[PDB]
Design a protein around this ligand. Structure first.
Ligand code: I41
Ligand code: I41
Ligand code: ZN
Length: 956
């Protein structure tokens, strides 16, 4: 009945709360495809995944398949304009991206729902006749090198590659994924390689249709999506490439029983423990890896972490199966170490083996599997609806692993109980497979080897057999017990009926001196979850730097205490967030509403009758010290972003202020602080989800009552509710702050043009300008000028004030990035004058679609409202108000605004810049305007003292 379509799959099993409609099918050419029909989606999306990635790079050009990924975007035969694709999305409310794993390259985009076809068509071309333009290839190789450069100094990446580089060197596993300027131009030049050819070769070899999965999601009928996909994608070449496999492990027991001593960049202290295991993927229906993962990783009473944490040796632990490739995986157990811990490593690893030994002696436990099976089934049934980009991307990957029908459920549902497999994998977690890496500053000087790509310093040893034998004889250890029934598993999921007096936006259903309660019963998502947000205002949480440190430490200590208890709930999909703000504290409780008042009570109770364990205090303080220090190792752009926040906020305590005031925090002094901070508060809360007005009031009152009883809390005076103001920069003024980043050899810059207060009109002016320049900023500063990998434009908003910001991390100097951005601003004024009246309306419509996307999941609606509430703006209808107004703006309005606030010689141009310089300093392109001469900020206080502050914004 149809020659283009091999199979039509069946009734892809979905959660019965999922209203979206699905069809899977194999094409003639072998492409696996899922089609998602959602007649209500605001954005359509699609994704393609090719089962080939950087493991299939040729040896002589590292990171080629990653680089090829970068180039599919920059031009194809049918749509040859360098940024046809980029621009097409921008103009139609879309966004796009790609990643490359060892074994996949994965491409996704989303677009306004009615331009799915336009978007999708420009997209199919990536896989049919791309161009790899000679001029692009040349330019874009720099993007890759920046991306690598960004990664060079960050520990996560260094360890990641140092693993690869200590396995069998002949194994594809050992390769360098990212690539750089050296590997992809400098060197293929030296060895006479035409790269455009080499890209064409690879794309031709491997981007074969039998290695591809597609997901398309749109408002269209399933039958409509079907036709569309067949049209755009039947034309893909089947080169019948055999799928690569790696049946032989890269860790070969020439490589087992090794210890590695590693020098970190940040001052961190972890121990990595790895075991090579076979590929468990096929066992997905029983999932032994998860089971042993669930147990070893456990954090409850009688768990492994519990003991290590109790001898003060470790703080956090992570265990479980680790993805490798077709043919191999790892099983890992990783901990961070205390100072004491770093000296009892041998011991810690022994404790790990005692726990494994316990699991062997107890045997595999069906009741535990039954629990995992039940949590997973509940998780699946009541899973939140996904944003379409993530969703298509995600399924496109897993289409390569599961029958069409199982794609939605395969990652969730458990079916087979498999003692044998559990017992089999358990047999591999033995000292004679073990690999140990310790990462610590204490190995500086003491290392003797260097990893070539990132420059990592390490020493390598055999583990002395004394020590292996010593681990092999792991006794049972009475302090280790399996978890007991998880009491927190939800049993009640009944959706309460929508009330007689329910409203579309959160209602102010309580306004005492103690508390302001915002509430809305869920009229949208119908899952048995709720979101409970509380802002606790106390002025002592930021009164000074020392107090700030205590507010923090207090909160960490508390979290640390409850960890054992709450982890049970985390697994039952009930979780909490608790950190300190400049305003006081913040507390979220998210998840299956069923046992939710219970966790809340246990938190507030613990919070208000807290007892501090000295040894916990000691450790967490040392951790926080390192933590503050380690800011000096963060990326140049975060540095620049931070300094700006420091420059434009009425009050803010610097990292050095905090760390110097931190040696001053004794155990007795914190013990005073807590009862003190809790003594007067005000509380604003949003309660949102499957709960009733009375359930809500009860919860709010219950919180208050617990503080009143146990901490004697009373109300703050309304006038103590200081919110903080933004600094107000003069007309035609330009200030520069300058610092150096000591770790990173990129530099960074933020430029901020301050405009005015937030207001329906000023808001849209900035937003619309932001939109029109969004994609050209990126296309000019990265694609053409290749100034860096990190290139960001868009609105900035703080303390009620707003403006335009640019962020760039780059090889070239800040004063230079300044000129190219200011140059760019003129290019924009020109092309706004030049751009068609319909071209202009696209951007309006585009920003409108963007602004109007309905939240898909409950906690995404919550976020929007909490936005309004913590900002004291309380404009729950902003999206409608503000769109209405946007639709009535003209080319003329936006030019005035630009010539008013933004242009180089603007009447009211307020401009500050942060230049963060790299470790080491002190044409084809358009006309940069000559700039004023800046006022170089030398002192953050002398700076803020001498300028007006802005008014805080008006409510309602
Ligand atoms: C939830 O059940 C688990 O399997 C454990 C639990 C755990 C919680 N805290 C420490 N362990 N989680 C994990 O093992 C995390 N995994 C898998 C994952 O994140 O999907 C291991 C992992 C994570 C990152 C990088 C390599 C392995
Ligand atoms: C600084 O700019 C970016 O964030 C870019 C790409 C982008 C394209 N259009 C808007 N932004 N990078 C990423 O998002 C990073 N990806 C990798 C890549 O694009 O090469 C990281 C990543 C890693 C694992 C899973 C998903 C994404
Ligand atoms: Zn990349």
């Amino acid at each position: 009945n149809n020659p283009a379509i091999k199979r039509i799959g069946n009734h892809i099993t979905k959660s019965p709360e999922d209203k979206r409609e699905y069809r899977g099918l194999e094409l003639a050419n072998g492409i696996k495809v899922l089609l998602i029909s959602d007649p209500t989606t605001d954005k359509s999306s699609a994704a393609l995944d090719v089962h080939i990635g950087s493991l299939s790079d040729p040896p002589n050009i590292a990171g080629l398949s990653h680089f090829l990924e970068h180039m599919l975007f920059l031009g194809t035969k049918k749509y040859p304009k360098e940024n046809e694709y980029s621009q097409f999305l921008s103009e139609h409310a879309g966004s796009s991206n790609a990643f490359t794993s060892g074994e996949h390259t994965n491409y996704y985009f989303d677009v306004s729902h009615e331009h799915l076809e336009g978007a999708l068509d420009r997209f199919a071309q990536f896989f049919l006749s791309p161009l790899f333009d000679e001029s692009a290839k040349d330019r874009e190789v720099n993007a890759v090198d920046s991306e690598h450069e960004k990664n060079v100094m960050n520990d996560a990446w260094r360890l990641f590659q140092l693993e690869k580089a200590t396995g069998n060197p002949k194994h594809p596993f050992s390769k360098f994924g990212t690539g750089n300027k050296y590997t992809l131009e400098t060197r293929p030049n030296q060895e006479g390689i035409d790269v455009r050819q080499e890209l064409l070769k690879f794309h031709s070899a491997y981007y074969s249709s039998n290695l591809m999965a597609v997901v398309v999601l749109g408002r269209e009928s399933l039958d409509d999506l079907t036709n569309l996909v067949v049209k755009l994608f039947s034309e893909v070449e089947n080169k019948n490439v055999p799928l690569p496999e790696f049946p032989e492990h890269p860790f070969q027991e020439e490589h087992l029983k090794q210890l590695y001593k590693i020098v970190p960049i940040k001052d961190i202290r972890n121990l990595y423990v790895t075991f090579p295991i076979p590929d468990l993927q096929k066992y997905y229906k029983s999932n032994p890896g998860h089971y042993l993962g669930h147990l070893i990783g456990h954090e409850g009473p009688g768990s492994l972490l519990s003991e290590l944490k109790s001898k003060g040796w470790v703080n956090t632990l992570v265990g479980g199966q680790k993805e490798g490739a077709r043919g191999f995986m790892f099983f890992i157990i990783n901990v961070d170490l205390t100072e004491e811990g770093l000296l009892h490593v041998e011991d810690i690893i022994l404790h790990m083996f005692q726990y494994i030994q316990k699991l062997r002696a107890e045997g595999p436990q069906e009741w535990v599997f039954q629990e995992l099976k039940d949590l997973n089934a509940v998780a699946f049934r009541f899973k939140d609806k996904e944003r379409p980009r993530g969703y298509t991307s995600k399924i496109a990957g897993i289409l390569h692993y599961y029958p069409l029908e199982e794609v939605l459920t395969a990652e969730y549902l458990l079916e087979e109980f498999r003692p044998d497999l559990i017992e089999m994998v358990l047999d591999k977690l033995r000292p004679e497979n073990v690999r140990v890496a310790i990462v610590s500053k204490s190995f500086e000087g003491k290392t003797d080897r260097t990893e070539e790509w990132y420059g990592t310093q390490y020493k390598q040893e055999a583990i002395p057999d004394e020590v292996i034998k010593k681990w092999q004889n792991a006794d049972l250890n009475g302090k280790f017990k399996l978890p007991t029934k998880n009491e927190f598993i939800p049993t009640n999921f009944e959706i309460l009926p929508l009330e007689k007096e329910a409203t579309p936006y959160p209602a102010l259903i309580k306004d005492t001196a103690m508390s302001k309660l915002w509430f809305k019963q869920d009229d949208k998502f119908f899952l048995p979850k709720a979101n409970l947000n509380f802002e606790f205002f106390s002025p002592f949480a930021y009164v000074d730097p020392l107090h700030s440190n205590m507010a923090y430490l207090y909160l960490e200590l508390l979290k640390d205490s409850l960890n054992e208890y709450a982890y049970a709930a985390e697994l039952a999909g009930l979780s909490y967030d608790l950190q300190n703000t400049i305003y006081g504290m913040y507390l979220s409780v998210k998840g299956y509403n069923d046992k939710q008042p219970i966790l809340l009570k246990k938190i507030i109770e613990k919070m208000a009758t807290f007892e501090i364990d000295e040894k916990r205090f000691e450790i967490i303080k040392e951790a926080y010290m390192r933590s503050l220090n380690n800011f000096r190792a963060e990326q140049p752009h975060q540095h620049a972003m931070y300094y700006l926040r420091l420059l434009m906020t009425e009050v803010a305590w610097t990292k050095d202020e905090l760390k110097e005031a931190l040696d001053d925090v004794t155990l007795p002094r914190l013990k005073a602080f807590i009862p003190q901070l809790l003594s007067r508060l005000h509380i604003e809360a949003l309660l949102h989800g499957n709960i009733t007005k009375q359930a809500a009031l009860g919860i709010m009152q219950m919180v208050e009552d617990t503080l009143i009883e146990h901490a004697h809390t009373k109300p703050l005076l309304p006038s103590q509710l200081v919110r903080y103001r933004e600094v107000q920069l003069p007309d035609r003024g330009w200030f520069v702050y300058q610092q150096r980043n000591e770790v990173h050899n990129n530099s960074g810059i933020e430029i901020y043009y301050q405009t005015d207060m937030q207001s329906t009109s000023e808001n849209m002016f900035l937003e619309l300008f932001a939109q029109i320049i969004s994609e050209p900023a990126f296309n000019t500063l990265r694609t053409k000028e290749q100034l860096g990998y990190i290139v960001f434009s868009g609105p900035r908003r703080a303390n009620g004030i707003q403006g335009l910001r640019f962020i760039i991390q780059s090889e070239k100097p800040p004063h230079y990035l300044e000129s190219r951005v200011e140059a760019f601003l003129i290019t924009m004024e020109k092309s706004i004058e030049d751009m068609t009246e319909e071209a202009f309306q696209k951007h309006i419509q585009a920003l409108a679609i963007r602004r109007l996307d309905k939240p898909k999941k409950l906690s995404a609606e919550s976020a929007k409202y909490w936005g309004e509430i913590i900002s004291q703006q309380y404009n729950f209808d902003r999206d409608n108000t503000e769109v209405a107004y946007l639709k009535t703006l003209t080319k003329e309005d936006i030019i005035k605004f630009y010539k008013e606030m933004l242009a180089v010689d603007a009447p009211r141009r307020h401009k500050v810049s942060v230049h963060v310089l790299a470790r080491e300093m002190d044409i084809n392109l358009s006309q940069a305007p000559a700039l004023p001469q800046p006022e170089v900020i030398q002192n953050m206080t002398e700076f803020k003292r001498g300028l007006p502050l802005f008014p805080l914004v008006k409510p309602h």
